[PDB]
Amino acid sequence: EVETFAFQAEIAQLMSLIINTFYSNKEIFLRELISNSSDALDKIRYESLTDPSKLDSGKELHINLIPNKQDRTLTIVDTGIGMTKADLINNLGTIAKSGTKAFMEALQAGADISMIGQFGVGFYSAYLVAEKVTVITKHNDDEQYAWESSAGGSFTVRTDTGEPMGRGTKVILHLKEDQTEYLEERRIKEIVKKHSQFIGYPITLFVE
Numbered sequence: 146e147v148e149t150f151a152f153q154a155e156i157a158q159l160m161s162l163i164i165n166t167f168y169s170n171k172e173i174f175l176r177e178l179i180s181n182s183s184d185a186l187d188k189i190r191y192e193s194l195t196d197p198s199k200l201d202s203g204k205e206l207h208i209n210l211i212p213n214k215q216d217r218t219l220t221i222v223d224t225g226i227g228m229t230k231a232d233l234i235n236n237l238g239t240i241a242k243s244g245t246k247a248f249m250e251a252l253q254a255g256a257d258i259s260m261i262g263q264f265g266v267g268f269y270s271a272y273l274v275a276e277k278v279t280v281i282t283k284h285n286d287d288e289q290y291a292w293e294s295s296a297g298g299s300f301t302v303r304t305d306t307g308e309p310m311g312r313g314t315k316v317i318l319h320l321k322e323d324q325t326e327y328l329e330e331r332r333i334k335e336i337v338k339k340h341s342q343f344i345g346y347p348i349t350l351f352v353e
């Protein structure tokens with residue numbers, strides 16, 4: 146069963162701003178997602194120092210970037226802490242309300258969209274480049290879920306029946322038709338080197 150939910154109002158407004166504003170420097174979406182992955186990997190690492198069993202679901206702490214030209218997707222995979230059902234449905238949105246208001250406010254005093262990560266809502270930047278985002282995630286204390294949204298004010302969540310992932314998150318960007326440059330190996334390498342070159346986990350850029 147697929148459950149459908151309405152985003153809190155501030156998040157829907159943020160998403161529409163990201164989709165509608167003219168802003169050419171879209172490449173920043175990638176470092177925002179890699180930074181979120183990096184924090185997640187930090188978190189499971191720090192938690193394992195006191196409970197080694199938290200890594201029974203996978204010891205390797207890493208990030209993979211996988212382009213797929215056939216599906217027109219770019220997927221950012223991590224083996225971080227992952228997200229629970231309550232994170233997806235409710236708590237991340239709850240946390241996101243304050244950062245949204247602040248970011249929207251800064252967007253005058255003249256900030257620009259690239260500064261979105263300074264407000265803790267950098268995930269939404271995915272919508273600079275993707276028409277649909279699917280997030281598959283598995284946290285130690287919960288089941289594997291799929292979250293999905295094409296924006297428009299709503300999102301779905303369901304138990305994922307796909308291939309089990311151990312622990313972590315996969316953010317799958319279904320790219321807009323004019324954003325396929327982010328499938329190209331040279332373009333992804335250039336962005337990673339420019340914006341994400343000292344992430345303290347191995348980043349593997351898969352090739353097609």
Ligand SMILES: CCCCn1c(Cc2ccc(OC)cc2)nc2c(N)ncnc21
Pocket residue numbers: 181182185223225226227228233237238240265268280292313314
């Ligand atoms: C607010 C940060 C934490 C949420 N989060 C994020 C940000 C976020 C926020 C809202 C979302 O809505 C579904 C999805 C991800 N990415 C993460 C990741 N790769 N692993 C673990 N947690 C992640």
